[PDB]
Amino acid sequence: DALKVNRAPVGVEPQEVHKWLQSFNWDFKENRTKYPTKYHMANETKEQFKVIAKEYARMEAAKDERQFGTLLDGLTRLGAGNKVHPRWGETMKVISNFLEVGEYNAIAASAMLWDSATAAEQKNGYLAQVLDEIRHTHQCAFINHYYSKHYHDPAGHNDARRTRAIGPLWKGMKRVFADGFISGDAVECSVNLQLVGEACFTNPLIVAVTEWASANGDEITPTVFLSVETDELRHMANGYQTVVSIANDPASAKFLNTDLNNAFWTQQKYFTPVLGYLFEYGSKFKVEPWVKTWNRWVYEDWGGIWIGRLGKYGVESPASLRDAKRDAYWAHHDLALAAYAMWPLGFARLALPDEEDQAWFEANYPGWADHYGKIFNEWKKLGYEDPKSGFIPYQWLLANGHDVYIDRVSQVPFIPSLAKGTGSLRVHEFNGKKHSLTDDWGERQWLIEPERYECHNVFEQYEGRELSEVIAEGHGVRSDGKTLIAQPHTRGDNLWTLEDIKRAGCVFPDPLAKF
Amino acid sequence: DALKVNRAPVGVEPQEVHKWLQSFNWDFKENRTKYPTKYHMANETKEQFKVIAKEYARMEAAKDERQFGTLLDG
Amino acid sequence: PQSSQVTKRGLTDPERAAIIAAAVPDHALDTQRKYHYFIQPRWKRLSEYEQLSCYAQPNPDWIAGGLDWGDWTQKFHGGRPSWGNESTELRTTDWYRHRDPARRWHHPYVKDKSEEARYTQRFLAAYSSEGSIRTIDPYWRDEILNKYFGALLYSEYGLFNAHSSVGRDCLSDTIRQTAVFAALDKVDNAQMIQMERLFIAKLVPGFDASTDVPKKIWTTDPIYSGARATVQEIWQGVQDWNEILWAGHAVYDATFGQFARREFFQRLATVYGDTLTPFFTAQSQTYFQTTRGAIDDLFVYCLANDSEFGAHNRTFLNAWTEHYLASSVAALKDFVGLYAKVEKVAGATDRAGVSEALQRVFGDWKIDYADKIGFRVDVDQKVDAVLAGYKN
Amino acid sequence: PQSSQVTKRGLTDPERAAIIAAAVPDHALDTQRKYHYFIQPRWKRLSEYEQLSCYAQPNPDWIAGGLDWGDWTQKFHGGRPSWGNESTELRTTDWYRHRDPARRWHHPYVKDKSEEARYTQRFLAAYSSEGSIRTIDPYWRDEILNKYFGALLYSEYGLFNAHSSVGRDCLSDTIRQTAVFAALDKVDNAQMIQMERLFIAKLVPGFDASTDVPKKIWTTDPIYSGARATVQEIWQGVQDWNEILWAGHAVYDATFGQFARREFFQRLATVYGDTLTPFFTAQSQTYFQTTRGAIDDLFVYCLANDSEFGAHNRTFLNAWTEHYLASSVAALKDFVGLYAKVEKVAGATDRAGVSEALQRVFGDWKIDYADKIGFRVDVDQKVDAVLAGYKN
Amino acid sequence: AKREPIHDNSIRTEWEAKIAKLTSVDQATKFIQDFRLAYTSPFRKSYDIDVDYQYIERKIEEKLSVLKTEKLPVADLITKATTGEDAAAVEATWIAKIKAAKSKYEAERIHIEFRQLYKPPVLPVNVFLRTDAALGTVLMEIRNTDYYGTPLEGLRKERGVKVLHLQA
Amino acid sequence: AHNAYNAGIMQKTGKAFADEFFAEENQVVHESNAVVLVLMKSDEIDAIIEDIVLKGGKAKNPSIVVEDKAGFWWIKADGAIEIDAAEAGELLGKPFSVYDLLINVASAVGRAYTLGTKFTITSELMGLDR
Amino acid sequence: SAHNAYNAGIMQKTGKAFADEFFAEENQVVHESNAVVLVLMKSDEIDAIIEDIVLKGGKAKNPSIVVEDKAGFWWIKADGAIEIDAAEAGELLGKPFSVYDLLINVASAVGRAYTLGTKFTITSELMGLD
Ligand SMILES: [Fe+3]
Ligand SMILES: [Fe+3]
């Protein structure tokens, strides 16, 4: 009544509103996903974390305050921004901005999981994931923004959202954790984004990399990236719930193994060579061989704890695994050939392996010295680092019959005459267009689904054009308008200019003209 | 009236409140210090930073979050 | 000990720090330290909001404003692009132009909402200790607030889910952020209404915070019939993401939503002695104005006045407004039937009171949205059309 | 260059870091890593609040609970100690026992208030944009709220300044913190009232936010005559710091203050259509309950039940309560004359409504304070003493 | 061959001049359909403007869409394709088409051609996206039936590629 | 020892590693009963490592291995890893809900969930097992 | 200007030379100085303020300004006054930045310090006496 009431102090915990979320949906005929999917089984699942909006915000904001305290206050007062080894500070231009687009695409894929979820609790989870993926886009951007302010080379930290478009390594990044998520079956994102992408590849990509950063003097990236991954544990919990629903109903389970192998191959095709190259060639101090990192995170832990355990329930070890293990051992060395050979098209300054590096490469990958090692040492002899040399190794590859091809499906470069990783060139003509495919898994994808895979490659866009003109047109220059962002060494002197590139007379060919 | 109002977005900054603080005191016989002092001169001065309680909390909390982030995290 | 190497930090280990210092040049290699300096600033100086958000979306030159080139690497079966112009009827010279006037990237967004989250719980702990619920009109509390405010959570929840395809489909970064923050704010509204109900249940024996009655009212009570039909259409009947955002926030929620939240539940709380509901509506109405600021920029500043497609966009926005304003007028006509259930308060719940509330909502909307896209509207005609649903 | 050395950091400079590593032992020199491990924990385990606050005050063994020894190094002219037992009539076995149940050291205190600070400005920016002031009863807004709510800021301000001698004189660290946090919360209340008035001034032409009318009413209007007499006495008439805190928060503010803030301005706002004032009273009432938690611990758990001085302390607390409760019922008797100026609302402003409001205030207070110190009080008698000032 | 600059070149300029001369909805509609049949998708007639066709398509869409708002009644923008057909009828026709397809090769060409003919602004956006998702559902399901069932050499025969090179 | 980061093949280098890496048996995944949990280093986490996982945690699960990976702790264990935020809040002397424990919990190879104030990462496949 | 150097004047001398001036008869009473000294706590925002405000426009208007690197903070000494506009700083930082936010990292201030709108200044003037 007007006088008597319980005056005990009470609030309402997030758990207490959360148990009512399932009742927030209501039935009407049009209440179903807008996106095409193969998966129509029952998916009325409970989310494993009792997150509501206010608590979502409290949780994430508490993370940010600590992170930005460490960046803007502590590490700035220590001058840590310039305590990074140049190889690694250059590597974070690529890793943070490339990951940034993976995060940005993950917002869109998580919105597809939100849209295709049928249970209100799973819509709740995917909303938080969508927000997290926005958080991670701004975190990756903050890393380069911070480096832009405090690191000795802001060029390329400070404009990658336009300068990435110059080079060929960025094409395949728009697939690996990007188009490959959002351009396809929406509930299949529980498999490609989550069960493969988040459960498998974020761990080396986002966590393991912080040990390499630290080894090389970067305490910025551990501060941000580790925080990023704290959100990932909620993400995969969402996806697992759906994977269970798929596994349990026989009509959906008959798609899961093919979607899993396709997603595994699609992500590892780019991730394996590119991240291994950035780790091992974009560092001075190495933590461990890339192939062991891959063995530990990808093959043994993700492979056994997720896939092998799901084997009890009909999920198969990816048929492409054997081809992938060959990639883990050699493909990043293959890619280094292309990366160093085509250095003017990037936005980072590279460093040929020094004598210490080369011994490490040969100790850990015997045969490196007699193959990759001798090539890099000849390039150095020819003036690879010297802007007056007139030497760019891409022209040298062609003059020795080492053509570079772009995979029509994955966009990953391939040098068949020098590769030790998985691959063989297939060149098909279809309706007057020539196409180069590079492995059994992607070739099947293109043969079955040609209208999904019409990505123009750098040779088709740049055909007949001289290198310095492509670079200038794409704004691949420092603020003086002439000195390249990209460099074949990491020293402060003898930086290459557009005129230095021009003297080499490199003009883009049609690699399939010979077929 | 009940239909027409200025709907421009406005708040109240700390100095807008601060300008009225001087008026918060009022005169009564016992309105003087409790402690022994030699200094009895007039001292009706203005403070040089226009701080109110909400703004005080906001600035100091801001400092704290950065400090404790550096300590507990980095 | 441990199996793996204890990696030495380059920042602090003497040998690695000395090696690093010898490798780092004594001079900067460029002077341009402004992250994405080439962004065209909306305001007098480039903001951190813009630096962190603008051009994160990797659009090619064939999606207006894109700096990239070439086709996507992988498309849908059939050929649907990862993002494409087919996603909406509206056109522009640059999909990146949009700027939230609150300049919310993720961090300031959760920072502000964290404040509300923690302070809400402190207010509830103290409100329960205060015993201030003792003076609320019990009929309002039990028959109107619990039942019909609870039912309103489903309108907020539907508008929240309307954003799922917008978050996938929309064509730039700042738009995607504006959309998703709006969606969280909508589902927050729904969770906050349910929080208030759960909170009252702890103070009032016999008060049932279950959503069974609110859900029955949302799904079958004629008072919400028009509202639910409109929400279902905006959420699940369309996929043009601009139409969803415009119909959702700029027509339906700015007319029906504002009436229900502000003219009915918030306003009438302060004539029925409800010292609790104003604390919750303060949040939903703050979120409404923050969302309105960003929705207004996208459709008024950017699309309705785009130098090449402004009039073209106003043609569509005029057509959507015509359709969804009719829908919202129908939702309000149904909704004012609720006044036949409330205790009469002169100037609030009689015909003059409801007439003035509709004049504020429709008058405000004419100023805030209709006048800015060239949509003509007779305010009195719309007020009178709703008052036909009012039982004297 | 620069004139002075650019000092090399021992954390990062290779040569100095190697020297430091060689000097640092390979093993910890003790295992006790709990800061001030010897504090007796109030709760199941020592809190950071206790570790940071407890025994900061360097009391000697002749101020009960002190761990130091000897006389102060410098005393007042005459011999008054830096801190001393002469500062209060109350006695205890240990001045350090007090624990704020909110466990506020400085950081959580400004953290919470910062949240409220930033969210208030967002709410006002949205409330002004919302136009919700349009439905407030103008008589309430102009003749009652502006004038007498404004005038109440001087009660809050007087209670704030009552703490000045408390912050100097009180005898332990945790007591000093609750005292000072309580003082800031009171001047915040006073500034927030003035903030609300300044805000309405921006929305309502002709509305005067000057404190001239509020000050004239506080200082001369018979409605606040009893109240002003009491805060002047509590603020400037006494120096026993326990008497100030007890009379200030546990008697005067818990009766007059709670009635004016919660039963009059907050409650009536929600019968006169005031959608603005509840947002501000929500803060003052939250602060009241937080302050009450710490005041209750000091006077009930620590002093009224001190194992050796409990009854001795109740003798004084009973004498103070008798006096300042008389002061407060007189303040309330004056204050209920304000009801003669408000628009009549059955159950709120009639004799029955004010009687139930006084039954809540005096009834709640009997439970919250009187019953815990053994102070006898007839609630009906006090209600009737105040209702003698109510004009039918 | 030698490509011109990426974002500003004679091909794009020449097509903008062609586009500028469209003056009715029917004319721009035949223009965009013919363009999309000739130059987009793997079954296009010509790759001669391959690195420019996507931008050029956007510019035709822009011309057709403004011609729509200038010239058509509002009801037509919502319910009709610029061919004049009823939009709902177009949806029903092509969903039935793809559901009657006997093989993934039949179904893929039905989907691809639907987009060539009715991609907005030809068909209203809401109807197009719903129709396009319905078709993609069917094409996905049939394609993901026994995905690894046909060896690569058979897949290449079925696709009808001319195999120019297979590395040993 | 089997839960060490450099367990098994990870001990080998050069040719010996390559031989086992490319051995036929190792071209398919092998089911593992382990979980892997990564803890972001911080004041609160380091306390949780020393006084919870390496004491009560390892006492209940002797198979847990904690390795120092510079910026984070890498923890592998048979079956499950559990951390109670209520117990952690008692060590830290400050408010500490399960959501606050998650501030610094990153990678989780295994099924992660919360139950009240406890966080668990488990080898169990809930909804498939049991 | 060398006279505002931290190691100016007597501070250049060592050993007996320093002792001789330090204990000189004339240096046993204070000497009026027209200088101010301001300490800025190092941070992202302050470091931007130092390089682009006090060392650019600041020293343009006041050439006597000396800025010294003291590891964790900047030491600033100038004749007459030092001035920092929070609005100019917020334009430089592209984020909300009032005079109270500027004061987050403004520490020691030897002189008469005050704020006037968005501007912080420390002056040698004796406000209320001069
Ligand atoms: Fe992410
Ligand atoms: Fe994720």
UniProtKB/TrEMBL annotation, chain B:
Q: Per its record, how is this protein called by name?
A: Methane monooxygenase component A alpha chain
The taxonomy runs:
Bacteria, Pseudomonadati, Pseudomonadota, Alphaproteobacteria, Hyphomicrobiales
Interval of the full protein contained in this chain: 12 to 85 of 526
Automatic annotation (TrEMBL), chains C, D:
Pfam families attached to this UniProt entry:
Phenol_Hydrox
Q: Where is the signal peptide?
A: none
Q: Which InterPro entries match?
A: Ferritin-like_SF (IPR009078), MethMoxA_beta (IPR054956), MP_mOase_hydro (IPR012078), Phenol_Hydrox (IPR003430), RNR-like (IPR012348)
- By what name is this protein known? Methane monooxygenase
> Record keywords: Oxidoreductase included?
yes
The alphabetized UniProt keywords are: Monooxygenase, Oxidoreductase
The Gene Ontology terms for molecular function here are: oxidoreductase activity, acting on paired donors, with incorporation or reduction of molecular oxygen, NAD(P)H as one donor, and incorporation of one atom of oxygen
Q: Does the keyword Membrane apply?
A: no
The record ties this protein, via Gene3D superfamilies, to: Ribonucleotide Reductase, subunit A
Q: Which CDD domains match?
A: AAMH_B
Recorded hits in SUPFAM superfamilies, A to Z, give: Ferritin-like (SSF47240)
Automatic annotation (TrEMBL), chain E:
A Gene Ontology biological process noted in the UniProt record is: methane metabolic process
Superkingdom as given in the UniProt entry: Bacteria
Name the UniProt key words of this record, in alphabetical order: Monooxygenase, Oxidoreductase
**InterPro entries associated with the record:** Me_mOase_g, Me_mOase_g_dom1, Me_mOase_g_dom2, Me_mOase_sf_g, MethMoxGammaMmoZ
User: GO molecular function: any one?
Assistant: methane monooxygenase [NAD(P)H] activity
Q: Which NCBIfam families match?
A: MethMoxGammaMmoZ
The protein here is known as Methane monooxygenase
Q: Which organism is it from?
A: Methylosinus trichosporium (strain ATCC 35070 / NCIMB 11131 / UNIQEM 75 / OB3b)
Automatic annotation (TrEMBL), chain G:
What is the protein name given in its UniProt record? Methane monooxygenase regulatory protein B
Q: Which InterPro entries does the entry mention?
A: MethMoxRegMmoB (IPR054955), MOase_MmoB_DmpM (IPR003454), mOase_MmoB_DmpM_sf (IPR036889)
Specify the domain of life of the species encoding this protein: Bacteria
Question: What keywords does the record list, in alphabetical order?
Answer: Monooxygenase, Oxidoreductase
Q: Which organism is it from?
A: Methylosinus trichosporium (strain ATCC 35070 / NCIMB 11131 / UNIQEM 75 / OB3b)
GO molecular function of the protein, one example?
monooxygenase activity
What family does this belong to? Belongs to the TmoD/XamoD family.
